Short mmCIF file of C-alpha atoms and ligand atoms in Angstrom, two decimals:
data_model
loop_
_atom_site.label_atom_id
_atom_site.label_comp_id
_atom_site.label_asym_id
_atom_site.label_seq_id
_atom_site.Cartn_x
_atom_site.Cartn_y
_atom_site.Cartn_z
CA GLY A 5 13.19 -7.50 7.73
CA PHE A 6 9.42 -7.87 7.56
CA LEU A 7 7.04 -5.41 9.24
CA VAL A 8 3.99 -7.45 8.14
CA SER A 9 3.84 -11.25 7.50
CA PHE A 10 0.68 -13.35 7.71
CA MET A 11 -1.25 -16.11 5.97
CA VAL A 12 -4.55 -15.17 4.35
CA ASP A 13 -7.10 -17.05 2.27
CA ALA A 14 -10.53 -16.40 0.72
CA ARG A 15 -11.93 -15.50 4.16
CA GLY A 16 -9.69 -12.38 4.18
CA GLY A 17 -7.43 -11.04 6.93
CA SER A 18 -5.25 -8.13 8.00
CA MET A 19 -2.19 -7.24 9.99
CA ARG A 20 -0.80 -4.05 11.48
CA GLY A 21 2.96 -3.57 11.15
CA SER A 22 5.08 -4.37 14.21
CA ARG A 23 6.10 -0.72 14.80
CA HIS A 24 2.42 -0.05 15.40
CA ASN A 25 2.41 3.43 13.83
CA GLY A 26 0.00 3.26 10.87
CA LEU A 27 1.40 0.64 8.52
CA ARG A 28 -1.29 -1.91 7.85
CA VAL A 29 -2.36 -4.44 5.24
CA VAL A 30 -6.02 -5.30 4.75
CA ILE A 31 -6.89 -8.20 2.40
CA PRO A 32 -10.71 -8.28 2.22
CA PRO A 33 -12.78 -11.48 1.88
CA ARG A 34 -12.69 -13.12 -1.58
CA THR A 35 -9.81 -10.96 -2.92
CA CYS A 36 -7.46 -13.84 -2.42
CA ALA A 37 -8.55 -17.18 -3.98
CA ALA A 38 -5.82 -19.48 -2.63
CA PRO A 39 -3.76 -19.40 0.60
CA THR A 40 -1.00 -16.78 0.38
CA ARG A 41 1.61 -15.38 2.74
CA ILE A 42 1.19 -11.59 2.62
CA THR A 43 4.30 -9.56 3.56
CA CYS A 44 5.56 -5.97 3.76
CA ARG A 45 9.08 -4.62 4.29
CA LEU A 46 10.39 -1.04 3.99
CA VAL A 47 13.54 -0.26 1.94
CA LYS A 48 15.95 2.70 2.04
CA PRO A 49 15.94 4.49 -1.38
CA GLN A 50 19.73 3.94 -1.68
CA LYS A 51 19.33 0.14 -1.52
CA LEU A 52 17.65 0.58 -4.96
CA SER A 53 19.43 0.41 -8.34
CA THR A 54 16.95 2.89 -9.89
CA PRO A 55 15.52 5.20 -7.24
CA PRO A 56 12.45 7.35 -7.93
CA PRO A 57 13.61 10.21 -10.16
CA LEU A 58 12.34 13.45 -8.62
CA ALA A 59 11.82 16.89 -10.14
CA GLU A 60 13.18 19.91 -8.26
CA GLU A 61 9.99 20.44 -6.26
CA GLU A 62 9.37 16.72 -5.58
CA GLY A 63 10.57 14.73 -2.55
CA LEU A 64 10.02 11.30 -1.01
CA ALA A 65 7.29 11.33 1.66
CA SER A 66 7.80 7.69 2.74
CA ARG A 67 10.27 4.88 2.65
CA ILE A 68 10.02 2.44 -0.26
CA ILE A 69 7.35 -0.17 0.37
CA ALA A 70 7.94 -3.76 -0.84
CA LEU A 71 4.73 -5.83 -0.68
CA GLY A 72 4.89 -9.62 -1.04
CA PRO A 73 4.36 -11.74 -2.97
CA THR A 74 5.75 -9.39 -5.64
CA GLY A 75 3.32 -9.44 -8.58
CA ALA A 76 0.35 -10.89 -6.69
CA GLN A 77 -2.91 -10.24 -8.53
CA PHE A 78 -6.06 -10.04 -6.39
CA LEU A 79 -9.62 -10.72 -7.58
CA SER A 80 -10.76 -7.41 -6.11
CA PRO A 81 -8.86 -4.51 -4.49
CA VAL A 82 -6.87 -4.77 -1.27
CA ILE A 83 -5.96 -1.86 1.06
CA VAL A 84 -2.50 -0.86 2.25
CA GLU A 85 -2.05 2.01 4.70
CA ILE A 86 1.43 3.56 4.87
CA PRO A 87 2.78 6.22 7.23
CA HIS A 88 4.37 9.27 5.62
CA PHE A 89 6.81 11.80 7.06
CA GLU A 98 0.34 17.21 -2.13
CA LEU A 99 1.03 13.48 -1.74
CA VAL A 100 1.12 11.06 -4.70
CA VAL A 101 1.65 7.30 -4.78
CA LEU A 102 4.31 6.08 -7.18
CA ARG A 103 4.84 2.45 -8.09
CA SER A 104 7.49 0.47 -9.94
CA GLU A 105 6.45 -2.90 -11.36
CA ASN A 106 9.95 -4.44 -11.58
CA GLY A 107 12.24 -1.68 -10.22
CA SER A 108 13.25 -0.02 -13.51
CA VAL A 109 10.43 2.51 -14.17
CA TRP A 110 8.40 4.62 -11.76
CA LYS A 111 4.88 5.84 -12.50
CA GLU A 112 1.87 7.26 -10.69
CA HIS A 113 -0.43 4.74 -9.04
CA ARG A 114 -4.07 5.64 -9.45
CA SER A 115 -6.79 3.49 -7.90
CA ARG A 116 -9.47 3.11 -10.57
CA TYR A 117 -11.98 2.30 -7.80
CA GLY A 118 -10.84 4.82 -5.21
CA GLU A 119 -12.16 5.94 -1.84
CA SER A 120 -15.87 6.18 -2.74
CA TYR A 121 -16.16 2.37 -3.06
CA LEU A 122 -14.40 1.52 0.19
CA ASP A 123 -17.33 -0.34 1.75
CA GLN A 124 -17.79 -2.46 -1.39
CA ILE A 125 -14.06 -3.22 -1.44
CA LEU A 126 -14.18 -4.37 2.21
CA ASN A 127 -16.85 -6.92 1.28
CA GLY A 128 -18.41 -7.28 4.74
CA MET A 129 -15.03 -7.45 6.51
CA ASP A 130 -15.08 -6.72 10.25
CA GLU A 131 -12.44 -4.00 9.91
CA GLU A 132 -12.58 -0.30 10.75
CA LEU A 133 -11.05 2.03 8.18
CA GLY A 134 -10.82 5.68 9.24
CA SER A 135 -11.74 8.63 7.05
CA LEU A 136 -9.28 10.54 4.85
CA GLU A 137 -9.20 13.45 7.33
CA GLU A 138 -8.50 10.95 10.12
CA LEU A 139 -5.64 9.57 7.99
CA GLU A 140 -4.38 13.11 7.28
CA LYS A 141 -4.22 13.76 11.03
CA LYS A 142 -2.27 10.54 11.66
CA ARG A 143 -0.05 11.24 8.61
CA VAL A 144 -1.11 7.99 6.92
CA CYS A 145 -1.76 7.33 3.21
CA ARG A 146 -4.17 4.66 1.97
CA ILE A 147 -3.24 2.79 -1.17
CA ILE A 148 -6.08 0.84 -2.83
CA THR A 149 -4.63 -1.72 -5.31
CA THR A 150 -5.62 -4.98 -7.11
CA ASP A 151 -1.95 -6.00 -7.44
CA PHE A 152 1.43 -5.80 -5.72
CA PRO A 153 4.23 -4.13 -7.71
CA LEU A 154 7.86 -4.57 -6.65
CA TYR A 155 7.63 -1.09 -4.98
CA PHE A 156 5.36 1.66 -3.79
CA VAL A 157 6.60 4.99 -2.39
CA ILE A 158 4.83 8.21 -1.35
CA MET A 159 6.04 11.34 -3.10
CA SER A 160 5.38 15.00 -2.25
CA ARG A 161 5.00 17.74 -4.91
BR1 LIG B 201 5.13 -1.07 11.10
BR1 LIG B 202 -0.85 0.22 13.45
BR1 LIG B 203 -10.72 -16.57 -11.47
BR1 LIG B 204 11.88 6.04 -13.70
BR1 LIG B 205 -7.61 -0.54 -7.37
#
C-alpha cells in the first residue's frame, strides 16, 4: 500500500517514494514536535465514495494522495512533491467536500520553511520539466489531488 513510510521527530526527515519518480515527503526540522510515523499512499478515484466533482473543462492530473497520519497538524509547513500526468491542488478534509488548497506561505518562503534542513528542493521550472507539483501544507487532510483546468 504505502509509497512512503518513515519515522520523524523534531530533527526533521524526508523520504522519496519507492517508485522513485518524484513523489517525496519533506518534514523540516521543528515542524513535528513528537515522534510520528509519516506515510503516503495513492488511491484510485473510484475507491472514493465522493470523488472530486469536475467541471466540463476540468480533469484529474494525479492520483488521489492520502497522507498519514490523517489530520496531522504541523508547527510550521511541510513539503510534499507529487508527480502529475493550469494545475490546481484540491484537498478534502474528511472525504465529503473538495476545495482548493492554497499555501498561505507559498514558494517565496521555501528556505525559511526548510529551517536549515540539508535537503535540495528544485525550482518550479525544474519541477515543471519533471512533471512534479509541490504542495506546501501545515496539515494533512484525508486527500489531496492535482486537477487540471
Ligand atoms: Br513513489
Ligand atoms: Br524520487
Ligand atoms: Br505548541
Ligand atoms: Br465536493
Ligand atoms: Br502552508
